[PDB]
Amino acid sequence: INEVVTRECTIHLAKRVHNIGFKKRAPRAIKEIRKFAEREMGTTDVRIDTRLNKHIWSKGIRSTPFRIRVRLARRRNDDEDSPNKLYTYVTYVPVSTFKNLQTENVESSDD
RNA sequence: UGGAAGACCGAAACAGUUCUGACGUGCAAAUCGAUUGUCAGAAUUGAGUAUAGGGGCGAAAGACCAAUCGAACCAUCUAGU
RNA sequence: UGGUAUGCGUAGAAGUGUUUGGCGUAAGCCUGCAUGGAGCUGCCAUUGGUACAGAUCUUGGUGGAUAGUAGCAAAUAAUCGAAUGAGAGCCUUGGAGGACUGAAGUGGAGAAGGGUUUCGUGUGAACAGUGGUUGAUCACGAGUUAGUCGGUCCUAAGUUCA
RNA sequence: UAGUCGAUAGAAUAAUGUAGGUAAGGGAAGUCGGCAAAUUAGAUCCGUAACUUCGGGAUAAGGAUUGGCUCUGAAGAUUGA
RNA sequence: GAACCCGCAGGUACGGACCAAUGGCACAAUACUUGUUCGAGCGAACAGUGGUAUGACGCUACGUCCGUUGGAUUAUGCCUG
RNA sequence: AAGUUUAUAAUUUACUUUAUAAACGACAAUGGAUGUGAUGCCAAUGUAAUUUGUAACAUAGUAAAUUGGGAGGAUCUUCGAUCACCUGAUGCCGCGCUAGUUACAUAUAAAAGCAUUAUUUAAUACAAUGACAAAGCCUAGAAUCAAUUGUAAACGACUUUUGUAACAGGCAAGGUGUUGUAAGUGGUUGAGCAGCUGCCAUACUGCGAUCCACUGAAGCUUAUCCUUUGCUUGAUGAUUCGA
RNA sequence: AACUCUAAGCGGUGGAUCACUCGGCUCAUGGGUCGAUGAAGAACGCAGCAAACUGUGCGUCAUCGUGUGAACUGCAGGACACAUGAACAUCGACAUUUUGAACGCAUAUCGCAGUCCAUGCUG
């Protein structure tokens, strides 16, 4: 049951990050953004964009942005077929002031 | 004003005070941390070089002389008793 | 080992595994079966480097500890992630990204030392107490050009010796 | 800047550790012993003993003060009017 | 001169709980602050938790709360004999 | 001398209680059996590693079945959604009959064996268990792993979890905290300072810690906060177990 | 169940045991054969392919002469020159590096002279 719908989802990193050892704070942030992505889209195959890279990592490892605005896009696995016909594509939509945003159901496929 | 001193605090440097700490089948047949002595001179040190076994060298502990010193190491006497 | 059974023997010797059967109080013996491949044994005398469980024995091998318990922990230490491959956190690598040593350097040169270790290419097992396509590994090639820099020469401490 | 990011890693991040800290109130009662730890520390100013070989003791003791901004003064060089 | 059982309240020592208050710790939370870096600024990063003031979910103290009631019968006092 | 009882006279729920008379006077007895609801080894009138079958007489005298209702019982025990007892009703298979005495007939028995125990039985009876193909009745779980909670924890384990809803999870929102007034913008707030000065009042243009207003704000909020007709999303893996 | 124990079969692990051996060991026998005419030993470079062993020295895995008479051999260049010779032995003719007694002097230097003869260049 493929679905292949894209929505821009909400993650508060800070709680997950809380009391985890520094320097492992954002190797845990990336892993947890995958964990959230995997729970939402149901697809084990999580890909994280190179735009997503820089937005966690700008403010260097001790001060990971407490709340992050996520774009989660469930897409079809093309060539050399993974056992999971789906993959989720995770990118950051560049906002400095994420709070107050509830998740919205349309990103049109070919951005 | 000047800038003396085997002067003092303390780096590089050298050493190893106390924890009688870590380690102590370790990284290491002597290391590691903290702490600390000394640091312009009887200082620190490289290379070349001299001194060789019952000998040397010793700011002298019987310390050290190639992880070895109350007499090195190696072979032989020696399958010593 | 001398003699002997006109001994046995590649048609399977010796060796050896062996809930084969049996003998002897035992030391030990024979035989079957399987394996084997090139030589061997009984008896009478004859000689010994002659029989092993040990000697904090020797030498080689192997267990329990323990397919994992010590550990592989100091210098924070990664990480997104593109490429490739049999496999890729490192090691292959860009881009990116967190930092490190913090010019008294984990830098840039040389001596003392090293000895091909430098470098390209190939790149697998072993090695890198982890992986490892990569390396100071492993395989295959190349490279160190001087009248002026050192050695050379010179003397020192000191030495070789007519 | 140049060079690293290799010190096998991940998840958990238990006890006990190690290495680094903090702890009211009391404040060495602890212990062999203030060991370990803490206080103290730079600078400028003020003040400064016993004792003394008159050099020191001395950073004695005991006190004050230190940011930022905004002003002000002092401290030099050279020709010219 | 019975601090003597009935009766009453408190504490001690021991033990077990519990974190509300109060106190302790640091979220490397928030602020402030120094040194440096991001052109400055915001907001951060680095000083292996940078320091300092405050400091919650949470843990935990020195904090507080809770710790039963009979029989058998010893010692012993006794009946009847 | 502790004591088992009977009976008469009383007495009682209780071989209890009272008086009279006796009695097994820890005898020998008694302790196996009164098999004490008089078992067996009987039924079998030939009792048997065959079963007996069939006739009469008279005495004693036997019983086979079913259903309903009312009350009762259970201390480690072979079926507490079980087994009784009593009472009433229904009918009729007459299925059995036994003991005594007596009639009639017969298979086993003649198991060779003269040494019959030896290697030492099983038709049968009763009790349990089985299950090949098949047959006759009844009924349609969960556990554990993954994922999940934190009340739990080194790891297992413990405690929670998963119905398009009592949902569960990630947010945003709100409550609750914590710190202490953000950015940005405006103000001569502001000791002051530079630099240009008019045909006349004079000043302005920048700089300036900090203050004020927007701003009891901004940030942070529990992961081990509380809450949600708000948002979106999940709802789609593994193994094994029986009387 | 799993594991453990005990035994057995089979597979590993491991190289004992046996049988073999161009070697070792000991006794006996014959001979006397290093060197300034430059030794023994060392270093160095050498095979078509070699890195060693072994062989050799710049003529480098070997050359004359002599004997025999067709290989070497892993692959090959070769093989031809098998009748004048392979290849091995013999090895009496030569070569026999840099050294080392080691000899011009030295040697953490393959370093530095002198002399005679000789060559090229320049003249």
Side-chain angles (χ1 to χ4, degrees), chain A residues 16-35:
Chain A
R16 298 175 155 81
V17 163
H18 210 285
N19 207 51
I20 218 76
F22 290 76
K23 293 84 57 173
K24 306 175 173 178
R25 287 185 183 207
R28 282 275 68 204
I30 49 179
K31 282 175 183 299
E32 267 70 83
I33 279 163
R34 291 192 188 84
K35 184 175 162 184

Side-chain angles (χ1 to χ4, degrees), chain A residues 14 19 38 54 56 63 66 84 91 101 110-111:
Chain A
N19 207 51
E38 186 166 348
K54 52 186 170 184
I56 313 184
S63 279
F66 296 83
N84 290 99
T91 187
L101 269 290
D110 191 49
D111 304 301

Side-chain angles (χ1 to χ4, degrees), chain A residues 19-70:
Chain A
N19 207 51
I20 218 76
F22 290 76
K23 293 84 57 173
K24 306 175 173 178
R25 287 185 183 207
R28 282 275 68 204
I30 49 179
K31 282 175 183 299
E32 267 70 83
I33 279 163
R34 291 192 188 84
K35 184 175 162 184
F36 177 57
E38 186 166 348
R39 292 166 76 180
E40 294 288 287
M41 294 300 115
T43 192
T44 185
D45 195 348
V46 187
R47 301 195 180 182
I48 285 176
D49 207 64
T50 194
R51 196 163 57 161
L52 193 292
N53 176 192
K54 52 186 170 184
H55 290 72
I56 313 184
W57 284 113
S58 281
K59 302 186 185 180
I61 215 158
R62 301 218 296 214
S63 279
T64 62
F66 296 83
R67 294 141 69 153
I68 281 173
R69 181 61 179 189
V70 192

